[PDB]
Amino acid sequence: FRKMAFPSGKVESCMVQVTCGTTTLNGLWLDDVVYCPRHVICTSEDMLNPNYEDLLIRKSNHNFLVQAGNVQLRVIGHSMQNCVLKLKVDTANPKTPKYKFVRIQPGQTFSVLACYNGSPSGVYQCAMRPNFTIKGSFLNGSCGSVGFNIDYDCVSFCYMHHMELPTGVHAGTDLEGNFYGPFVDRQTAQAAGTDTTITVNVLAWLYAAVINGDRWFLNRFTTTLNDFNLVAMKYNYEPLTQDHVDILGPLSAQTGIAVLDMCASLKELLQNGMNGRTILGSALLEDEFTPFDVVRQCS
Amino acid sequence: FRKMAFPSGKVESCMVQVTCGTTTLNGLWLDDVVYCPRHVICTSEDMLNPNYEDLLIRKSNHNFLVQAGNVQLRVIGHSMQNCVLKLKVDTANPKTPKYKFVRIQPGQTFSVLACYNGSPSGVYQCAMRPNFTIKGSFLNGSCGSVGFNIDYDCVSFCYMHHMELPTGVHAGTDLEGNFYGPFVDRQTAQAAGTDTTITVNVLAWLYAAVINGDRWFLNRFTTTLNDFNLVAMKYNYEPLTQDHVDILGPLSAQTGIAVLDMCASLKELLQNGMNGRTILGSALLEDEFTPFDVVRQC
Ligand SMILES: COc1cccc2[nH]c(C(=O)N[C@@H](CC(C)C)C(=O)N[C@@H](C[C@@H]3CCNC3=O)C(=O)c3nc4ccccc4s3)cc12
Ligand SMILES: COc1cccc2[nH]c(C(=O)N[C@@H](CC(C)C)C(=O)N[C@@H](C[C@@H]3CCNC3=O)C(=O)c3nc4ccccc4s3)cc12
């Protein structure tokens, strides 16, 4: 059981480079539109307080250099949607996948295709944290990299990359250009809200460990949902809802371990520690696998 | 630091399925050849101790069903090379990337594109253990999935998947069909050697820590390579080779910390423990990031 990203080929065929003046970042080319972070139009003396509508009206189509591989794409129009710029180009992308734009929920996972200069560099899994940051791996020039899920050849784009916080975690928008969390696309040091642990994911991961032949952390005890949530909240874990319990049903039925029995296992791990032992190779409780991630991989 | 796979598109375009009878494995289509594990020709009562040479003489080109999706590729020749079957087909793959077949060493990492019935399902990074197993994620139907690295658009294929050991780790071949480690392609419970920690990668991790300002473990000692290797083996760490010293060269230059000085730092950590301190936030030393991976992410 490992962190597993979706195959990235359908998305790689959509990554382009977008240059405005001195600024170069990545864009996403779908049909005849290139989506990219709007601050491609900012110079260094603009990043602190950019009045984006006022900056954009001053730009012409020919101010935008869009490159797909070695081929330049001519911008024939542009519009802004929140923090995303939509460049209309004179060529539709012939490898546009079936796709959707979705806004994901905290606790859900996606694959990130990290890109530099329009060229894909790496792919890895991320969870949307409860405080709406992600713990990614992004360097200078990574803006415009996207996150996505795939379901039967349909690519659901859910993230475009914009920012690395002082703490080293990452912030970005959906493909409508609305940030996840309270972040703003200006060159300022921004703090996130206090993060918490994704309880339903930790439980899914404990089930994954049992499916894979590890049972050492189980115990003979049970707990009520509310008593578990009282302890969970004390340890900065998100509350577990009945919807979460239902969602864990399939994993519960596969292993024969009731959800509240697994909650009693996690309660013991929170109160007693792991005592130097490991689960699925980790010395820490892992919260970035969803129940679906476990089912998709183990089955 | 994240375990980061290579973008998989160039390899996705090369995955096909190969069927003999009711047995379907994944295959790799490059130019006009498809490569796949040879036991696609096996029946269930042939798997304990297959006579592959005998089994292959009873096969003709027309017994092999090669499909890209639902599109059949006609087989015009077949041959066996070690544990892989090479099927010549009448169509050169137009999406064949620039490629090489390489045989990797323990400690080297690569991306695995897990595939089922020729259809790619997920991608993740793996490290070849010193006992020549990988800690993969493979189910029934995964054989023929490949592992690879990508350097300047050239795909270096290094792994093809064959087997899950009773311990749950995985074993396979290079693309010439030679197994990594002492394993054989038979339906049989096989044990790997006792595994060890990948010293060269731990050193890379320590260099990554220094690069990021976490350097409490640096000391004013040095060691010879031989003295280090004798200590390392007593803690179940791999001995360093000359090649390991050389691949740590760029990180040593970047930090100004000689390789043997970092070895003396690691030796101290082995003999004395971390004493509750951490390195890069972790109480455990990471051994699945190569010097290349560290440079990639730093
Ligand atoms: C005093 O200001 C700070 C104080 C403390 C921490 C801080 N973080 C950031 C911050 O992240 N800024 C954004 C840009 C803002 C405008 C959204 C930014 O540089 N995004 C990167 C990805 C970054 C870079 C490093 N790895 C990350 O993922 C991206 O590619 C883009 N680069 C530029 C460069 C110039 C113009 C546009 C873009 S868009 C500022 C900052
Ligand atoms: C008493 O025998 C055992 C005792 C204790 C542990 C054991 N492990 C294996 C073992 O691995 N066998 C090989 C096959 C051998 C011939 C290399 C095998 O099933 N490979 C799988 C990938 C496996 C499956 C589960 N996840 C893993 O990665 C693969 O895809 C292939 N499937 C077939 C199906 C039919 C024909 C060819 C192939 S090749 C046997 C075994």
XYZ file of C-alpha atoms and ligand atoms in Angstrom:
679
model
C 0.000 0.000 0.000
C 1.607 3.243 -1.231
C 0.655 6.779 -2.192
C -0.406 6.350 -5.805
C -1.048 9.123 -8.310
C -3.236 8.886 -11.388
C -1.442 8.344 -14.709
C -0.670 11.858 -15.875
C -0.560 11.492 -19.665
C -3.958 13.037 -20.418
C -2.938 16.134 -18.440
C 0.650 16.371 -19.753
C -0.782 16.883 -23.255
C -2.475 20.046 -21.936
C 0.416 21.843 -20.228
C 1.780 24.965 -21.915
C 4.045 27.881 -21.041
C 2.645 31.416 -20.683
C 4.921 34.469 -20.738
C 3.988 38.103 -20.111
C 6.920 40.489 -19.937
C 9.442 39.068 -17.475
C 7.028 36.521 -15.955
C 6.718 32.902 -17.096
C 4.445 30.263 -15.565
C 2.426 27.243 -16.675
C -0.987 27.141 -18.308
C -3.634 24.497 -18.985
C -4.753 24.232 -22.640
C -8.270 22.815 -23.112
C -10.108 23.248 -26.429
C -9.174 26.781 -27.585
C -8.574 28.257 -24.100
C -5.434 28.451 -21.941
C -6.094 28.789 -18.201
C -3.307 30.232 -16.077
C -2.816 32.283 -12.892
C -3.666 35.910 -13.572
C -0.537 37.327 -11.920
C 1.380 36.327 -15.053
C 0.584 39.958 -15.945
C 2.346 41.315 -12.842
C 5.847 42.735 -12.771
C 7.990 42.708 -9.630
C 6.694 46.177 -8.710
C 3.111 44.928 -9.094
C 3.084 41.886 -6.821
C 2.440 43.734 -3.505
C -0.950 45.360 -4.307
C -2.043 44.380 -7.825
C -5.265 45.972 -9.074
C -5.868 43.113 -11.457
C -8.707 44.563 -13.564
C -6.748 47.779 -14.016
C -3.591 45.876 -14.993
C -5.394 43.546 -17.387
C -7.226 46.240 -19.365
C -3.782 47.685 -20.213
C -2.596 44.441 -21.845
C -2.999 43.453 -25.480
C -3.408 39.970 -26.928
C 0.103 40.144 -28.368
C 1.536 40.792 -24.878
C 0.968 37.077 -24.137
C 3.477 34.507 -25.418
C 1.922 31.017 -25.219
C 4.088 28.038 -26.189
C 2.978 24.411 -26.558
C 6.220 22.502 -26.982
C 7.955 24.315 -29.835
C 4.739 25.785 -31.295
C 3.580 29.289 -30.434
C -0.169 29.670 -29.924
C -1.595 33.026 -30.968
C -3.754 34.668 -28.298
C -6.898 36.046 -29.961
C -8.653 37.246 -26.803
C -8.533 37.167 -23.012
C -10.837 37.291 -20.013
C -10.340 37.029 -16.272
C -12.357 34.776 -13.963
C -11.370 35.487 -10.342
C -7.665 34.576 -9.959
C -7.478 32.745 -13.310
C -6.777 34.252 -16.718
C -8.493 32.650 -19.717
C -6.482 33.174 -22.909
C -8.362 32.404 -26.116
C -5.985 30.914 -28.687
C -6.337 30.356 -32.413
C -5.807 26.583 -32.176
C -7.882 24.077 -30.239
C -5.817 21.506 -28.352
C -6.233 18.292 -30.396
C -5.537 16.170 -27.303
C -8.153 17.770 -25.041
C -9.440 14.997 -22.757
C -12.973 14.659 -21.585
C -12.850 16.921 -18.567
C -14.692 18.729 -15.797
C -13.852 21.522 -13.370
C -14.686 20.576 -9.778
C -14.139 22.237 -6.414
C -12.971 19.580 -3.997
C -13.834 19.234 -0.297
C -11.317 19.278 2.552
C -10.025 15.776 3.134
C -10.259 14.744 -0.513
C -7.155 13.781 -2.474
C -5.893 14.572 -5.967
C -2.844 14.072 -8.163
C -0.529 17.045 -8.755
C 1.379 17.338 -12.027
C 4.249 19.620 -11.119
C 5.389 21.643 -14.129
C 8.127 24.144 -14.965
C 8.309 26.206 -18.162
C 5.302 24.304 -19.484
C 7.109 20.965 -19.091
C 5.795 18.325 -16.659
C 8.344 17.369 -14.011
C 6.709 15.072 -11.461
C 3.440 13.611 -10.287
C 2.322 12.905 -6.742
C -0.726 12.704 -4.502
C -1.952 15.542 -2.242
C -4.867 15.961 0.155
C -6.787 19.188 0.546
C -6.091 19.882 4.231
C -8.884 21.017 6.571
C -7.230 24.465 6.637
C -7.274 24.481 2.802
C -3.523 24.162 2.288
C -1.798 21.275 0.554
C 1.539 19.721 1.445
C 3.087 19.671 -1.990
C 6.510 19.989 -3.568
C 6.656 23.178 -5.644
C 9.568 25.472 -6.570
C 9.944 28.798 -8.363
C 8.130 28.626 -11.688
C 5.629 25.972 -10.585
C 2.592 28.277 -10.665
C -0.130 27.054 -12.971
C 0.626 23.409 -12.238
C -2.672 21.595 -11.778
C -4.243 18.937 -9.606
C -6.786 16.431 -10.827
C -8.571 13.137 -10.414
C -9.392 10.672 -13.194
C -12.551 8.569 -13.437
C -13.024 6.470 -16.609
C -10.975 8.718 -18.916
C -12.691 11.907 -17.625
C -10.235 14.316 -16.001
C -11.690 16.325 -13.109
C -9.413 19.338 -12.587
C -9.631 20.649 -9.033
C -6.496 22.702 -8.314
C -4.225 25.275 -9.908
C -1.085 26.238 -8.035
C -0.373 29.816 -6.887
C 1.584 30.146 -3.648
C 3.977 28.697 -1.072
C 3.311 29.900 2.466
C 6.156 30.775 4.859
C 5.571 27.389 6.567
C 6.360 25.578 3.301
C 2.807 24.378 2.602
C 0.995 25.404 -0.569
C -2.095 27.325 -1.620
C -4.033 27.643 -4.838
C -7.378 27.921 -6.552
C -9.953 25.829 -8.269
C -10.165 26.218 -12.049
C -12.734 28.981 -11.603
C -9.944 30.972 -9.953
C -11.326 30.938 -6.405
C -8.763 30.198 -3.710
C -9.105 27.336 -1.342
C -8.892 29.014 2.047
C -8.369 32.630 3.090
C -5.417 33.294 0.815
C -4.932 36.184 -1.590
C -2.813 36.381 -4.761
C -0.495 39.156 -3.623
C 3.186 38.989 -2.649
C 2.691 38.810 1.121
C 3.545 36.342 3.864
C 0.272 34.616 4.723
C -0.624 32.236 7.541
C -3.236 29.521 7.324
C -5.745 28.661 9.989
C -4.839 25.980 12.483
C -4.706 22.660 10.732
C -6.380 19.508 11.975
C -6.083 15.818 11.167
C -8.476 14.145 8.707
C -10.009 11.503 10.982
C -11.947 9.533 8.371
C -8.729 9.179 6.353
C -6.707 7.891 9.332
C -9.396 5.259 9.873
C -9.386 4.317 6.181
C -5.611 3.914 6.404
C -5.883 1.686 9.485
C -8.272 -0.509 7.475
C -5.784 -0.544 4.597
C -3.197 -1.850 7.059
C -5.581 -4.648 8.131
C -6.358 -5.537 4.506
C -2.579 -5.811 4.012
C -2.073 -8.133 6.997
C -1.264 -5.869 9.978
C -3.507 -6.029 13.061
C -1.210 -5.105 15.963
C -2.990 -1.833 16.840
C -6.447 -3.421 17.186
C -7.959 -3.934 20.623
C -10.886 -5.669 22.264
C -12.694 -2.406 23.018
C -15.358 -0.255 21.415
C -16.529 3.339 21.771
C -19.585 5.393 21.007
C -19.377 7.892 18.165
C -19.691 10.841 20.520
C -17.147 9.556 23.039
C -14.731 9.023 20.172
C -15.344 12.526 18.865
C -14.693 14.069 22.278
C -11.247 12.460 22.404
C -10.618 13.107 18.698
C -11.293 16.831 19.033
C -8.996 16.944 22.073
C -6.154 15.684 19.843
C -6.975 18.213 17.062
C -8.713 15.628 14.876
C -11.731 16.495 12.744
C -15.091 15.177 13.982
C -16.255 11.861 12.546
C -19.770 12.064 11.099
C -22.313 9.334 10.445
C -21.701 9.994 6.742
C -18.036 9.138 7.378
C -19.087 5.980 9.240
C -21.257 4.973 6.274
C -18.456 5.783 3.813
C -16.188 3.433 5.793
C -18.833 0.694 5.560
C -17.280 -1.174 2.619
C -13.873 -1.298 4.316
C -15.587 -2.387 7.530
C -17.423 -5.198 5.759
C -14.267 -6.277 3.913
C -12.281 -6.668 7.147
C -15.067 -7.606 9.563
C -14.073 -4.741 11.878
C -16.894 -2.425 12.894
C -16.171 1.244 12.341
C -16.560 2.070 16.038
C -14.198 -0.774 16.911
C -11.605 0.848 14.635
C -12.368 4.176 16.364
C -11.534 2.443 19.630
C -8.228 1.361 18.062
C -7.452 4.922 16.973
C -8.451 6.228 20.401
C -5.897 3.885 21.981
C -3.223 4.983 19.498
C -3.923 8.653 20.257
C -3.814 8.167 24.033
C -0.958 5.633 24.230
C 1.159 6.574 21.218
C 2.622 4.122 18.760
C 5.542 3.263 21.102
C 8.119 3.144 18.317
C 6.032 0.736 16.244
C 5.012 1.407 12.641
C 1.873 0.985 10.548
C 2.319 0.347 6.816
C 5.862 1.693 7.171
C 4.928 4.953 8.911
C 5.937 6.097 12.385
C 3.053 8.589 12.215
C -0.669 8.282 11.684
C -1.308 8.927 8.001
C -4.311 11.041 7.012
C -3.921 11.566 3.243
C -5.659 8.413 1.964
C -9.434 8.646 1.538
C -11.704 5.613 1.891
C -11.963 5.559 -1.915
C -8.159 5.719 -2.260
C -7.925 2.584 -0.126
C -10.654 0.721 -2.012
C -9.271 1.736 -5.412
C -5.778 0.479 -4.548
C -6.424 -2.614 -2.404
C -9.064 -3.950 -4.810
C 10.196 16.285 0.542
C 7.724 14.149 -1.433
C 8.118 10.816 -3.186
C 7.592 12.091 -6.734
C 7.062 9.904 -9.778
C 7.981 10.845 -13.315
C 5.098 11.950 -15.560
C 3.852 8.688 -17.005
C 2.416 9.737 -20.383
C 5.332 8.557 -22.524
C 5.015 5.085 -21.016
C 1.184 4.979 -21.009
C 1.330 5.222 -24.805
C 3.403 2.026 -24.905
C 1.217 -0.247 -22.777
C -0.624 -3.096 -24.488
C -2.139 -6.394 -23.428
C -0.859 -9.839 -24.436
C -3.168 -12.855 -24.206
C -2.411 -16.554 -24.663
C -5.579 -18.548 -24.044
C -7.361 -16.942 -21.091
C -4.172 -15.491 -19.557
C -3.751 -11.740 -20.127
C -0.571 -9.893 -19.104
C 0.609 -6.366 -19.752
C 3.154 -5.763 -22.487
C 5.404 -2.909 -23.587
C 5.159 -1.848 -27.237
C 8.298 -0.121 -28.560
C 8.926 0.171 -32.308
C 7.592 -3.121 -33.752
C 8.287 -5.302 -30.689
C 6.102 -6.098 -27.683
C 7.898 -7.203 -24.493
C 6.089 -9.129 -21.771
C 6.731 -11.794 -19.124
C 7.209 -15.177 -20.745
C 4.808 -16.979 -18.402
C 1.877 -15.602 -20.418
C 2.296 -18.931 -22.265
C 1.778 -20.966 -19.071
C -1.342 -22.851 -18.075
C -2.241 -23.313 -14.424
C -0.735 -26.807 -14.204
C 2.449 -25.626 -15.953
C 3.323 -22.951 -13.366
C 5.013 -24.963 -10.587
C 8.029 -25.792 -12.786
C 7.403 -24.575 -16.343
C 9.515 -25.975 -19.154
C 9.467 -22.669 -20.999
C 11.542 -23.855 -23.963
C 9.150 -26.786 -24.403
C 6.110 -24.557 -23.910
C 7.287 -22.026 -26.505
C 7.929 -24.621 -29.214
C 4.234 -25.538 -29.000
C 3.283 -21.893 -29.717
C 2.915 -20.142 -33.074
C 2.572 -16.463 -33.934
C -1.185 -16.954 -34.331
C -1.557 -18.101 -30.699
C -0.691 -14.605 -29.387
C -3.379 -11.930 -29.046
C -1.737 -8.508 -28.724
C -4.162 -5.616 -28.239
C -3.836 -1.864 -27.918
C -7.187 -1.264 -26.317
C -9.473 -3.401 -28.454
C -7.296 -3.052 -31.573
C -5.405 -6.227 -32.430
C -1.754 -6.008 -33.501
C -0.791 -8.948 -35.697
C 2.164 -10.986 -34.415
C 4.737 -11.860 -37.102
C 7.462 -13.391 -34.918
C 8.215 -14.520 -31.403
C 11.259 -15.328 -29.331
C 12.272 -15.707 -25.715
C 15.079 -13.799 -23.995
C 15.620 -14.970 -20.422
C 12.273 -14.412 -18.657
C 10.686 -12.108 -21.257
C 8.866 -12.881 -24.471
C 9.512 -10.634 -27.480
C 6.637 -10.533 -29.952
C 7.413 -8.907 -33.292
C 4.297 -7.152 -34.560
C 3.531 -5.713 -37.948
C 2.990 -2.133 -36.673
C 5.671 0.181 -35.293
C 4.303 2.095 -32.301
C 4.033 5.730 -33.489
C 4.275 6.894 -29.868
C 7.572 5.094 -29.214
C 9.670 7.494 -27.114
C 13.400 7.826 -27.151
C 14.282 4.934 -24.857
C 16.968 2.739 -23.343
C 16.953 -0.541 -21.429
C 19.031 -0.210 -18.261
C 19.746 -2.515 -15.348
C 19.679 -0.611 -12.069
C 21.575 -1.113 -8.806
C 20.177 -1.361 -5.274
C 19.218 2.025 -3.889
C 18.247 3.454 -7.263
C 14.688 4.700 -7.560
C 12.264 4.535 -10.437
C 8.632 5.153 -11.271
C 6.235 2.223 -11.599
C 3.214 2.541 -13.898
C 0.830 -0.056 -12.496
C -1.352 -1.501 -15.257
C -4.216 -3.971 -15.497
C -5.270 -5.468 -18.850
C -3.047 -2.967 -20.666
C -4.771 -0.019 -18.988
C -2.660 2.188 -16.716
C -4.076 2.540 -13.219
C -1.562 4.460 -11.078
C 2.001 5.698 -10.816
C 4.331 5.774 -7.829
C 8.012 5.847 -6.974
C 9.909 2.726 -5.839
C 13.429 2.014 -4.599
C 15.290 -1.183 -5.415
C 16.169 -2.710 -2.052
C 19.621 -4.226 -1.443
C 17.919 -7.617 -1.407
C 16.591 -6.850 -4.915
C 12.920 -6.499 -3.981
C 10.720 -3.432 -4.216
C 7.984 -2.338 -1.827
C 5.388 -2.048 -4.552
C 1.619 -2.000 -4.793
C 0.606 -4.746 -7.226
C -2.473 -6.948 -7.486
C -3.454 -9.930 -9.582
C -3.088 -8.963 -13.231
C -0.257 -6.468 -12.724
C 2.536 -8.500 -14.331
C 4.210 -6.803 -17.237
C 3.831 -3.361 -15.653
C 7.130 -1.526 -16.005
C 9.362 0.798 -14.035
C 11.332 3.618 -15.555
C 13.220 6.879 -15.207
C 12.936 9.810 -17.623
C 15.965 11.992 -18.385
C 15.682 14.741 -21.026
C 12.704 12.990 -22.658
C 14.588 9.655 -22.889
C 12.779 6.866 -21.057
C 15.157 4.411 -19.390
C 13.162 1.252 -18.698
C 14.593 -0.660 -15.766
C 11.910 -2.994 -14.374
C 9.165 -5.362 -15.503
C 6.916 -6.858 -12.848
C 6.687 -10.650 -12.264
C 6.056 -11.697 -8.666
C 4.844 -10.970 -5.134
C 6.842 -12.688 -2.416
C 5.068 -14.225 0.604
C 6.263 -11.215 2.634
C 4.306 -8.888 0.336
C 7.252 -7.269 -1.443
C 7.729 -7.577 -5.179
C 10.251 -9.024 -7.599
C 10.815 -8.643 -11.298
C 13.255 -8.397 -14.176
C 15.049 -5.853 -16.264
C 13.777 -5.486 -19.835
C 16.212 -8.167 -21.021
C 14.285 -10.539 -18.749
C 17.053 -11.025 -16.149
C 15.665 -11.121 -12.620
C 16.901 -8.732 -10.016
C 17.962 -10.974 -7.159
C 17.811 -14.738 -6.767
C 14.215 -15.224 -7.907
C 12.790 -17.477 -10.634
C 9.500 -17.229 -12.558
C 7.675 -20.217 -11.069
C 4.582 -20.510 -8.853
C 6.541 -21.059 -5.697
C 7.168 -19.371 -2.346
C 10.558 -17.652 -2.548
C 12.486 -15.783 0.132
C 14.625 -12.728 -0.387
C 17.900 -12.207 1.415
C 17.941 -10.232 4.625
C 17.398 -6.638 3.641
C 19.657 -3.773 4.681
C 19.425 0.000 4.882
C 20.505 1.903 1.768
C 23.478 3.831 3.124
C 24.084 5.984 0.047
C 20.499 7.237 0.202
C 20.672 7.955 3.948
C 23.758 10.047 3.237
C 21.795 11.863 0.513
C 19.084 12.532 3.114
C 21.653 13.960 5.530
C 22.944 16.219 2.735
C 19.344 17.303 2.098
C 19.040 18.181 5.779
C 22.245 20.245 5.707
C 21.074 22.075 2.580
C 17.934 23.060 4.509
C 19.787 24.294 7.615
C 19.322 21.162 9.744
C 22.922 20.253 10.557
C 23.287 19.459 14.286
C 24.645 15.973 13.449
C 27.750 17.279 11.649
C 30.880 16.490 13.660
C 34.604 17.210 13.365
C 35.567 13.613 12.519
C 36.337 11.752 9.328
C 36.681 8.070 8.495
C 38.148 5.862 5.876
C 35.714 4.169 3.548
C 36.804 0.728 4.796
C 36.405 1.644 8.485
C 32.950 3.055 7.763
C 31.868 -0.038 5.833
C 32.913 -2.387 8.633
C 30.876 -0.375 11.153
C 27.926 -0.004 8.773
C 27.557 -3.750 8.329
C 27.250 -4.205 12.090
C 24.153 -1.947 12.021
C 22.594 -3.683 8.981
C 23.613 -0.843 6.654
C 24.863 -1.472 3.134
C 28.573 -0.954 2.488
C 29.370 1.996 0.298
C 30.887 1.437 -3.126
C 33.103 3.775 -5.124
C 30.081 4.509 -7.305
C 28.159 5.644 -4.208
C 30.973 8.011 -3.259
C 30.896 9.477 -6.746
C 27.131 9.976 -6.928
C 27.343 11.895 -3.641
C 29.893 14.198 -5.290
C 27.493 16.980 -6.323
C 25.849 17.163 -2.882
C 29.271 17.132 -1.196
C 30.401 20.043 -3.388
C 27.134 21.940 -2.844
C 27.472 21.741 0.944
C 31.254 21.738 1.293
C 30.992 18.587 3.446
C 33.307 15.811 2.238
C 31.627 12.441 1.671
C 33.830 10.727 4.258
C 33.068 13.501 6.749
C 29.369 12.830 6.271
C 30.116 9.121 6.712
C 31.681 9.910 10.091
C 28.548 11.869 11.013
C 26.358 8.906 10.072
C 28.687 6.536 11.947
C 28.126 8.608 15.084
C 24.342 8.473 14.589
C 24.516 4.683 14.219
C 26.646 4.184 17.335
C 24.855 6.717 19.564
C 21.317 7.125 18.200
C 19.422 10.344 17.572
C 18.828 10.930 21.328
C 15.314 12.242 20.746
C 16.487 14.799 18.192
C 15.071 14.827 14.673
C 16.390 15.333 11.153
C 14.110 17.049 8.631
C 11.301 16.666 11.174
C 11.628 12.876 11.378
C 13.072 10.648 14.078
C 13.787 7.988 11.438
C 16.390 8.229 8.685
C 14.970 8.018 5.150
C 16.692 5.648 2.715
C 14.537 5.817 -0.444
C 15.654 9.238 -1.723
C 18.662 9.047 -4.024
C 21.225 11.829 -4.436
C 19.431 12.623 -7.703
C 16.048 12.805 -5.944
C 17.482 15.232 -3.389
C 18.892 17.503 -6.085
C 15.544 17.215 -7.925
C 13.624 18.553 -4.903
C 16.217 20.925 -3.394
C 6.558 38.779 0.861
O 5.933 37.756 0.116
C 6.009 36.473 0.657
C 6.478 36.200 1.936
C 6.533 34.886 2.419
C 6.113 33.836 1.616
C 5.637 34.122 0.317
N 5.180 33.281 -0.631
C 4.842 33.973 -1.684
C 4.304 33.361 -2.950
O 4.131 32.183 -3.036
N 4.054 34.229 -4.050
C 3.535 33.655 -5.270
C 3.083 34.784 -6.191
C 1.876 35.526 -5.627
C 1.734 36.849 -6.383
C 0.622 34.669 -5.781
C 4.585 32.812 -5.989
O 5.737 33.131 -6.009
N 4.110 31.609 -6.635
C 5.006 30.746 -7.396
C 5.198 29.347 -6.791
C 6.028 29.574 -5.493
C 7.291 29.937 -5.717
C 8.182 29.092 -4.714
N 7.355 27.765 -4.521
C 6.113 28.204 -4.548
O 5.202 27.225 -4.846
C 4.712 30.829 -8.893
O 5.062 30.013 -9.669
C 4.577 32.250 -9.316
N 5.647 32.989 -9.208
C 5.523 34.301 -9.539
C 6.565 35.250 -9.468
C 6.335 36.580 -9.828
C 5.049 36.976 -10.226
C 4.021 36.005 -10.301
C 4.249 34.667 -9.951
S 3.282 33.203 -9.821
C 5.064 35.334 -1.480
C 5.584 35.409 -0.158
C 2.892 -21.197 -4.228
O 3.219 -20.076 -5.010
C 3.410 -18.906 -4.277
C 3.475 -18.903 -2.885
C 3.673 -17.703 -2.196
C 3.810 -16.509 -2.896
C 3.741 -16.526 -4.314
N 3.851 -15.508 -5.206
C 3.729 -15.996 -6.416
C 3.771 -15.166 -7.666
O 4.007 -14.008 -7.581
N 3.501 -15.805 -8.921
C 3.542 -14.991 -10.120
C 3.583 -15.909 -11.341
C 4.937 -16.611 -11.458
C 4.899 -17.676 -12.555
C 6.087 -15.636 -11.703
C 2.323 -14.082 -10.185
O 1.227 -14.442 -9.860
N 2.562 -12.738 -10.670
C 1.476 -11.797 -10.803
C 1.609 -10.542 -9.935
C 1.251 -11.017 -8.496
C -0.032 -11.328 -8.381
C -0.492 -10.790 -6.955
N 0.410 -9.511 -6.773
C 1.559 -9.883 -7.310
O 2.347 -8.842 -7.741
C 1.259 -11.498 -12.281
O 0.800 -10.494 -12.641
C 1.112 -12.730 -13.134
N -0.025 -13.417 -13.109
C -0.070 -14.549 -13.930
C -1.179 -15.407 -14.066
C -1.069 -16.489 -14.919
C 0.117 -16.712 -15.630
C 1.223 -15.865 -15.499
C 1.103 -14.773 -14.644
S 2.178 -13.509 -14.187
C 3.527 -17.369 -6.368
C 3.548 -17.700 -4.992
